[PDB]
Amino acid sequence: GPHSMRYFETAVSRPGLEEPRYISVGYVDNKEFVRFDSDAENPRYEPRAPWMEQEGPEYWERETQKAKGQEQWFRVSLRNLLGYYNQSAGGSHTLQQMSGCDLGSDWRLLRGYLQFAYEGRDYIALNEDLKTWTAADMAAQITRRKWEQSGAAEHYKAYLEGECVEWLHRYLKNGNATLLRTDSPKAHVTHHPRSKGEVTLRCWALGFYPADITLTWQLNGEELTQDMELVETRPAGDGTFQKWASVVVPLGKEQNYTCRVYHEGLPEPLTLRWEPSS
């Protein structure tokens, strides 16, 4: 299985208050391991996943000083953007950042990320090459020239190639059992009426980790695709995941249909049919 690390930072402006709310959240493989929130009692980065508690007080303070710096940056940056668009100060607005690196199952760096969004839309993003900038909205084209000519690409590129990947490897070793564990999915097929003469076969995968999974339906062992209903993979709430795929088949043809489950934890793809009774 692949692996990833992300830091998500957000500032949301609040009409009438000088300080935006700023929140930084760190993730490994989409799972939270640290968090900072300025609206807390006394803000500081906090440990979220239990394996993260092996970082000492110095670490939290070092990260905390980074958040405190960024908080002012986001305040100023939100205000400049508020200015540029001649927007009203009586509304709420959102400024976001996400950085980090993607690791393949061979632990190569696959992509480094540095991107910003305003109001939920790409504003500017560092391309996969870590050398060039893609400015979604014209406003950002001014910034792009600034950050190309000034050549501030290698600054962030080095960190993504270096520290991002070194700390992600550190966490995987320290957190192996939960981050490296796989759980095979538990699968079954249920059978549901739809209308006279037609039924829904629904293919369930329960309790798996990681979340990546592929569900397919096959007819005479030919994977159809069209007319297949699927749902966004969802957390079970206990650390594992769920997904299902359903298809409508004519009454009595159910046994020609096969669900296939592909998942890191399985040693061989699963093949299921609806099994009446038994």
Next chain:
Amino acid sequence: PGVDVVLDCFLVKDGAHRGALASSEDRARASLVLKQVPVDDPPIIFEASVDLVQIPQAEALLHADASGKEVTCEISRYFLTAAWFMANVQVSGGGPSISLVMKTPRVLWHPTLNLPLSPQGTVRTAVEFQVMTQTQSLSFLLGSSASLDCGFSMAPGLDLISVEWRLQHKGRGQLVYSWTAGQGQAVRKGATLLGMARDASLTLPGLTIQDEGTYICQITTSLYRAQQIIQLNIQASPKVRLSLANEALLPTLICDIAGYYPLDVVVTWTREESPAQVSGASFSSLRQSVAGTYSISSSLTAEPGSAGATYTCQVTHISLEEPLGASTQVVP
């Protein structure tokens, strides 16, 4: 023929360290002009000479205040001994949108307040490059063929180099088409179609949702690049089937609406015996087709009166200039 076009513009203050510091700034300025081919407080003045053709831009803006379009504009130092500036222009609802780049021969006086080469009243300059879309935001139907407009003019002397076409949407950004100087490099089955207007309109066929988002026709020339962006929204109107179910006790009326992207769904119910709208609506979890449209079910529970009623489950959605209906009836 021969004419002059003018526009209230802003312009950015030269202090570069600060620009590197944060994403934008708010420093004011004033207006810009040029000679065209038709066919108390003070403002700065920019005087730029037309070499090349500015495409459909002239007429478009000649009747722009008359047709009632709000026209942003903003000039900038392509920087941080001559000097070169770049402007951007947006016509809002009409849609033309453009990047111009300009030069000044410099040896010969400058303005103390701002570092701009001035001359007999004004900043004398001349424009040698443009990049326009006439299609700033575009809504196509799923699977149709999208042509995303992009022109550009080069002043003779400029050799083109690339015509990158990137997609940025949501989290990710990926290349689409890459025209080098002499060969193509499509990554998503897109064809691109003596010193005057060119065309770089990308063409996209059989759109699938992965094709939705923000496209950056990026025209890298010999000295400088000028991007223009085109927003591609993709619409898939739903289809709507009302039917009842569940065995005549707990008469659960139920409305399947599906095959629709984007996520916004409005579901209005009607009951009659000419009575109107009603309430108690209730939805289902969010499942999606394989291609990435969405499905859901509004399971308003049926109450027959004493002889019967008609329940009219309708939705409205982005593509529909009209709410799609489904009428069924019901008994004791």
Next chain:
Amino acid sequence: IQRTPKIQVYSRHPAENGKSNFLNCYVSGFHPSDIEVDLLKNGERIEKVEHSDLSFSKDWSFYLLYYTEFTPTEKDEYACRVNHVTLSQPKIVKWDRDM
């Protein structure tokens, strides 16, 4: 710009009356983050909702999770209720046992 929440209501373990398992409301992919979310049992706010953690994904959309101790019963009508800036009225999504 603004994006409507994608809302799923389900059981952690497969629904069986008696014993135990929990009820989850997964509210995903919405923007901006200001939001109101309730669990309902027969239209009544469920007083004990154990967790309302907030996190945000890669497409610049926030996602949260509202869940509590659960034992399914036929008489009741569990549901999840959402208010969001994109929703002119609160949105109510009913739980299906096998969905």
